[PDB]
Amino acid sequence: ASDTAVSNVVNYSTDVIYQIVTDRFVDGNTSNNPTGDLYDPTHTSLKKYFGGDWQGIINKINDGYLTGMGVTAIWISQPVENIYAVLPDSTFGGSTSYHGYWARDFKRTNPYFGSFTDFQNLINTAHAHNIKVIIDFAPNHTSPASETDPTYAENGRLYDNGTLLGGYTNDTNGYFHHYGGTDFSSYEDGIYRNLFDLADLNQQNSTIDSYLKSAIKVWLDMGIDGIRLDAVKHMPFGWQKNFMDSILSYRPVFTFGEWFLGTNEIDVNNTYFANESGMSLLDFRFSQKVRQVFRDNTDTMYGLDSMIQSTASDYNFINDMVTFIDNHDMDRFYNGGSTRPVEQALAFTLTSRGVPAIYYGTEQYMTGNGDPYNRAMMTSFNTSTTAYNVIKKLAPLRKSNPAIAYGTTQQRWINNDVYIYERKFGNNVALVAINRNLSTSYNITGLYTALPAGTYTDVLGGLLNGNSISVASDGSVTPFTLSAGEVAVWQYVSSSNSPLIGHVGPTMTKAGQTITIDGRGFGTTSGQVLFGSTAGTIVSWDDTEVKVKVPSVTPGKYNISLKTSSGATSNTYNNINILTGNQICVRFVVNNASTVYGENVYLTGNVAELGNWDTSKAIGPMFNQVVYQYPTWYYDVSVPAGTTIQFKFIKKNGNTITWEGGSNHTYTVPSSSTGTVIVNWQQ
């Protein structure tokens, strides 16, 4: 098959996701609408159900709105059952689960969004039209709750396909966390404490780990093509890594979590998570910078480039980064006045690296600063808007030009207002020019490009004032004037191709599994795929896509390369994580581990999942506030199930590594449930 086929659920680099808040899009069926205080037929009470549903989404696919726009994927609200309680809101006089983030039963659907048959209708309709379906999923909590007053809301109660498990109050089984609420003081604090008043699920509890793992398979069984994990910054990395493996070994689908980063914010945990969790992240570094430059004027084009550059050094898999300019949590990008800024932001996002996600109603210039004003009902479905057409013209390039989907990015010209960059994947090239200044034109001289000598017209057809250009044999471009607010896109798509890997998914595997290598020039007759210098088993070989079975190599990260039947060797795609086996989440605890000021305790050990004795890649720094207090440290770690591990704890700083004394601690990871090991620091 092809890397662009709707069936390639492990690669979204050639796609454009359209984010829909189900309730605020289209009420395709009035018979399923809530009744009473839960519903607001006038669409004025922003926190009540307005009636949007899966049938309405289906309607926009069949009538050509979404398709006509060039959308290849849709990300919808969490489909699971939510609480029916209407909470008190002083401002909006009513607060409901219209958003779908207040889970009640993860094994059932929200009656107002539709039945499982309705959900299926949607999945089948999307696919029939070559559209992938992404679902929001929030395993961090259930719903708003007061353990002191079980009368408030539905007590954060959790059901298992109808049968109640328990609520926040009198939680004798310990399904939830009872450490009060987070004040975001630390990474650990925001994990084991509640997000505001939402009942915190305790996924270290065996029953909870199993429920969640079994609940996700329910949806995978429904045919979904991707998952959006909510608040991945508020759950342990160890559990999530273990949860990711559970998904990937069942039926691998592109997965990306939400790890909010503020303006100018960079978090080394965020980077580490994106690189080791087995899942991808939404680019908040991208999004925030983009808004600083095109929307709020708190930064220039030099900051847009530093982001492009730094972001490419920190992320092992930048082609997996989900980019956006706004969402259900941010103020709507269009703030009034000129719409050029949004239009330029959309073009820049659409031609840049990663996976473009577009918040619904952007193409319609919808405005709204703050939740919930930024979640108003779909205004209109007008296809004349410049925005709608920028997407129409740009979206398809992600399937037609490998450079745009997988290529690197390079700044070819720049000043405070102008950004000219190049996307390159072998001989395929894409060059983009953007002038953010709405009142000043620039004379572009000294511009060079990888585009072949020739005359190139604007892909946008002058939609954003772009024009054609002429390139010489030496790559030089004839001087041209970039008008105010101009965006021009020029490209070259090679006819021939040497073997080039532009993508590999999933990034976290195990021997015996199958991975998909995507690119160009692979050939039609099978060659060879290598994990290091070890050849794997070809499951299927095509010019743009190759599927292979992971050889039984020593667990760890491997660099992939491919050799054509003509002996042509490709480029390598590095850092694919081959695990020891099925993952299990174990909580490691160490007592009496006292440290001097600014010194932390980490976990190193026998397996790859533990860093194989490499103190530089040791697990930590471990936690020591919520669950257990210093000097006892603990950490939730993903480890190979049913394996006997030798490990030791250490105290690190920057210029001292103190190892535990005595002999390595031993433990045999449990086969099916979560586990806990407790030991005392050995002198």
Would you list which residues are annotated within the binding site for substrate?
101-102, 141, 194-197, 228, 233-234, 328, 371, 375
258 scored as a contact of Ca ion (CB under 5 A): no
**What are the binding residues for Ca(2+)?**
27, 29, 32-33, 51, 53, 140, 191, 200, 234
Nearer to Ca ion, 142 or 435 (CB): 142
* CB closer to Ca ion, 56 vs 527: 56
Given 33, 339, 367, 575, the residue binding Ca ion (CB under 5 A): 33
Which range touches Ca ion (CB under 5 A), out of 192-200, 270-278, 280-288, 428-436? 192-200
Which residue in 200, 299, 320, 422 binds Ca ion (CB under 5 A)? 200
Catalytic residue among 40, 154, 258, 326: 258
- Closest CB 268 distance from Ca ion, rounded Å: 20
Q: Which range of residues in 196-204, 210-218, 390-398, 502-510 is near Ca ion by CB under 5 A?
A: 196-204
Taking the CA atoms of 7, 9, 15 and 21 in sequence, report the sign of the dihedral they define.
positive
What is the x/- site pattern for Ca ion, positions 283-312, by CB under 5 A?
A: ------------------------------
Rounded Cα distance between 391 and 414, Å, is: 25
As measured in angstroms, the least distance from the Cβ of 280 to Ca ion is 20
Residue partners of 313: CB distance under 8 A and separation at least 6: none
Provide, rounded to whole angstroms, the least separation between the CB of residue 598 and Ca ion.
27
Q: Is 431 helix (H, G, I), strand (E, B) or coil?
A: strand
* CA-to-CA dists, residue 277 to 260, 294, 446, angstroms: 16, 32, 43
DSSP conformation class of 375: G
Return the residues of window 481-540 that contact Ca ion according to CB under 5 A: none
230 in active site = yes
Pairing of strands 633-640, 158-160: unpaired
| Candidate list 3, 15, 154, 230, residue with the active-site label | 230
Closer of 36 and 598 to Ca ion (Cβ):
36
Which region, judged by CB under 5 A, interacts with Ca ion, from 45-53, 90-98, 103-111, 441-449? Answer: 45-53
CA distances from 501 to 243, 269, 356, 526, 532 (A): 28, 28, 20, 15, 15
Min dist. Cβ of residue 147 to Ca ion (A): 15
Instruction: Give the binding-site size for Ca ion (rule: CB under 5 A).
Output: 8
Q: Does 32 bind Ca ion (CB under 5 A)?
A: yes
Quote the least distance from Cβ 584 to Ca ion, whole Å. Answer: 19
What CA–CA distance (Å, rounded) separates 105 from 156? 11
* Orientation of helix 237-248 relative to helix 206-220, angle to 10°: 40
The C-alpha atoms of residue 464 and residue 378 are separated, in whole angstroms, by 25
Q: Which stretch binds Ca ion (CB under 5 A): 25-33, 256-264, 378-386, 393-401?
A: 25-33
Cβ proximity of 574 and 557 under 8 Å: yes
139 near Ca ion (CB under 5 A): no
When computed from its CA atoms, the radius of gyration of the chain, rounded to whole angstroms, is 26
First to last CA, the chain: 59
Instruction: Kindly identify the residues of this chain, within the stretch 363-422, that bind Ca ion according to CB under 5 A.
Output: none
Contact call for residue 142 and Ca ion (CB under 5 A): no
The region, left, alpha or beta by phi > 0 then psi within -120 to 50, assigned to residue 75 is beta
**108 lies in the binding site for Ca ion (CB under 5 A):** no
Annotated binding site: 27, 29, 32-33, 51, 53, 101-102, 140-141, 191, 194-197, 200, 228, 233-234, 328, 371, 375
Task: Calculate the CA dihedral of residues 419, 423, 424, 429 and round it to 10 degrees.
Answer: -90
- CB nearer to Ca ion: give 139 or 640: 139
- Nearest CA to 621 out of 644, 643, 660, 595 is that of 595
Report if residue 143 touches Ca ion, rule: CB under 5 A. no
Interacting residue with Ca ion among 27, 276, 320, 417 (CB under 5 A): 27
HEC sequence for 157-180 = CEEECCEEEECCCCCCCCCECCCC
Q: Which lies closer to Ca ion via its Cβ, residue 167 or residue 605?
A: 167
Give whichever of 196 and 597 is closer to Ca ion, judged by the CB atom. 196
Of 359, 368, 414, nearest to 387 by C-alpha is: 359
* Interface pick for Ca ion out of 23, 40, 53, 105 (rule CB under 5 A): 53
The answer to whether the beta carbons of residues 576 and 515 sit under 8 Å apart is yes
Span interacting with Ca ion, options 83-91, 200-208, 401-409, 411-419, rule CB under 5 A: 200-208
Question: Taking CB under 5 A as the rule, does residue 51 contact Ca ion?
Answer: yes
Assess 171 for contact with Ca ion (CB under 5 A). no
Helical axes 54-62 vs 116-128, angle rounded to 10°: 20
Nearest distance from residue 359's CB to Ca ion, in Å? Answer: 21
Whole-number minimum distance, CB 517 to Ca ion, in Å?
Answer: 36
Q: Following DSSP, what letter does each residue of 629-642 receive, concatenated?
A: -TT-EEEEEEEETT
Measured from the CB of residue 53, what is the shortest distance to Ca ion in angstroms? 4
Residue 125 or 561 with smaller CB distance to Ca ion: 125
Single out the segment in contact with Ca ion by CB under 5 A; choices: 93-101, 195-203, 436-444, 459-467: 195-203
Is 209 one of the annotated active-site residues of the chain?
no
What gap in Å lies between CA 512 and CA 504, rounded to an integer?
16
Using CB atoms within 10 A of its CB, is residue 20 exposed (0-12), middle (13-18) or buried (19+)? buried
Q: How far is the CB of 191 from Ca ion (least distance, A)?
A: 5
User: What's the min distance (Å) between Cβ of 182 and Ca ion?
Assistant: 8
| 50/40 Cα distance (integer angstroms) | 6
**CA–CA gap between residue 78 and residue 87 (Å, rounded):** 20
Secondary structure class of 119 (helix, strand, coil) = helix
- The residue among 190 and 485 lying less far from Ca ion, judged by its C-beta, is 190
Taking Cα atoms as reference points, which of 425, 308, 572, 463 lies closest to residue 13?
425
> Hey, is 389 helix, strand or coil?
helix
Nearer to Ca ion (CB atom), residue 135 or residue 195: 195
Nearer to Ca ion, 94 or 190 (CB): 190
Applying CB under 5 A, the span of 5-13, 50-58, 259-267, 310-318 interacting with Ca ion comes to 50-58
Paired sense of beta strands 73-76 and 132-137, if any: parallel
Q: Site mask, Ca ion, residues 218-257, x = CB under 5 A?
A: ----------------x-----------------------
Burial of 671 (0-12, 13-18, 19+ CB in 10 A): exposed
Interface residue list for Ca ion (CB under 5 A): 27, 29, 32-33, 51, 53, 200, 234
Give catalytic residue positions: 230, 258
